[model samples]
Target: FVEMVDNLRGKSGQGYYVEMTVGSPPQTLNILVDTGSSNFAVGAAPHPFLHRYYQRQLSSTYRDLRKGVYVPYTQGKWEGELGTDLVSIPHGPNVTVRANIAAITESDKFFINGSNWEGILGLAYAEIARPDDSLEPFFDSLVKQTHVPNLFSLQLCGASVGGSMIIGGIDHSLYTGSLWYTPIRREWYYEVIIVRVEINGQDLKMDCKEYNYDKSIVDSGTTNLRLPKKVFEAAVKSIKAASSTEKFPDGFWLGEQLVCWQATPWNIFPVISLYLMGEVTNQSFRITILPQQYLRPVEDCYKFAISQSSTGTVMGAVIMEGFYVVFDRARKRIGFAVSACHVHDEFRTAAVEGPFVTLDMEDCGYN
Candidate 1:
């Protein structure tokens, strides 16, 4: 049986969250769907940012493993204890699975003010799990217990439109066109090979190896399309050159300053494209993001959704919003297609194009 859960977009286009039923009495909490890490963590103790937390004392099936887990991210960190409890999705597969859960007692910037989610559900493999791989991830436990297919898919509609997360199978009706598959370079974080990047159809013209310096990943937790430091600079330069004559502040591209427009001038910005190595040899696939998708809207002002990252390329929600993404773990591949929810003519701003010939490189997947 396939498990499907509804997703609610977080505040200010941060991340998408879904509800999960945990413990014996079933405490439903909004859990952030994050493919970047591997830990099912919930706020166990009271924090200034959270409105609710998991009350472990009231759960009859709660079991504390007595192991400490500390997870640190680029912007936040949390300290918690490893434990196990009965878990299940309300509108998902009808079976309860006992899974490893981190009860977060301390955190800094992990749960932000005005956020909608109370917990984080890491969907990646166990290799990146906090503490060690000895702790099985929640999805791993769900697959083993329910005997469902080792695949899951996500459809993240834009802000306030809602979306869906289907575990163990795909909902063909949710997406349009045939699925485009790309090989998974690593199992740690759905790492894929990025071949090229373009701004308004103009290639960045950098060494292919630079695109995947340390590793390239498609992460749902990250809000923007984060590029390597050098690549990001090139993209910013190209964008500034292509945009209409407007003196944008230096802090605009740095994501420190917000620009407000009376009518939101989306046409001034150029379209951004990313090319990824395809499943077949000597082929690459292109994914395009229109100005509306990359320009983050917050109240009346907009923030640039492409930023500089010291690590590697991260294709996040900015690129994933208009596409239906499939995480085919059993086959070690990732699939993408236009999402049905975004197929409307006026609302459609992103696209997936090509199976074009790959660039001349020895190995695009080389890290």
Candidate 2:
């Protein structure tokens, strides 16, 4: 089954959300599709930022597990009560499965003002679930109950274009070319190894291990193409050197300020490429993103969507929007193909190029 997703780019920065029904009477809520974490959490109490929240009392089938659940993110954290309830996606598979739910009562920056989503649906494995892995995630329950293939695909159309998330199968028409498969180095966070990075076809020349510094993952929840401190510095330096003619303040690269390029051409920024380890040994695939995908436009100015990460590398929405991504759990691999939606005026917005040559390394997984 396929579910159409809505983007919160205009109001709450960057996040793709989908409609979901929870409880017996089925209170509908817009939930964020996050693959970085593993906890199905929703706003249960009244908050200033929320348009609406799930009232557990309104559900007759709600069962409070009486366990405290607390989950943390890079930006925010939330504390809630663990419970179980019947949940289903209106546009997804026609099956309502009993799944674990975290009824969020308190939060920090998790829910920002003007945010459209009231909940978060984590699509990653149970290994990162809050409290413990004993609680089966929503998708796990769905797969077990329906006995469907343990795979799902995503197409995140950047900016104004609508997006989609297909559960349990792939939609061939949504993408072009044969899917380039990459091994899942770890189950947590859909972790994958990033072998190299290139700017305008020029290699960064850093050690391959630096790209996979703590760990690297393709996360839909994160908005930017987050790079580790060293990698980010290298990228910034290269960008500055390449676009030397164009004047940009240091604040722009720091994400401390936005720049309005009324006179400056958008093409001044070079194309960025991320090389990920392929399914075979000594082979890699490159996913390239044009300036149109990374320079997030907000009103009159464009905000640089690439940021520095203290933890590790993250191929977030900035990169994911360029390709059709498949989370194939059963095979323990991720697949990438050129997205059908990534074209405008007969010109491709992004690209997936090469089964390129790579160094022969034993393991790129984080220690």
Per-residue lDDT over 89-148 for candidate 2, one digit per residue giving the tens place of the 0 to 100 score: 887766788899999999998887876779999899899887888888888888898876
Q: Which regions of candidate 2 deviate over 4 angstroms?
A: 1-14, 73-76, 159-161, 343-349
Error of 1 at 39 (Å): 0.4
The lDDT for every candidate, in the order shown, is 0.83, 0.83
Clashing residue pairs for model 1: none
**lDDT, model 2, position 303:** 84
- TM-score of each prediction: 0.93, 0.93
Q: List, residue by residue over 123-203, the lDDT tens digit for candidate 1.
A: 998999888998899888988888878988988887354778888789988888778888888889989888888887888
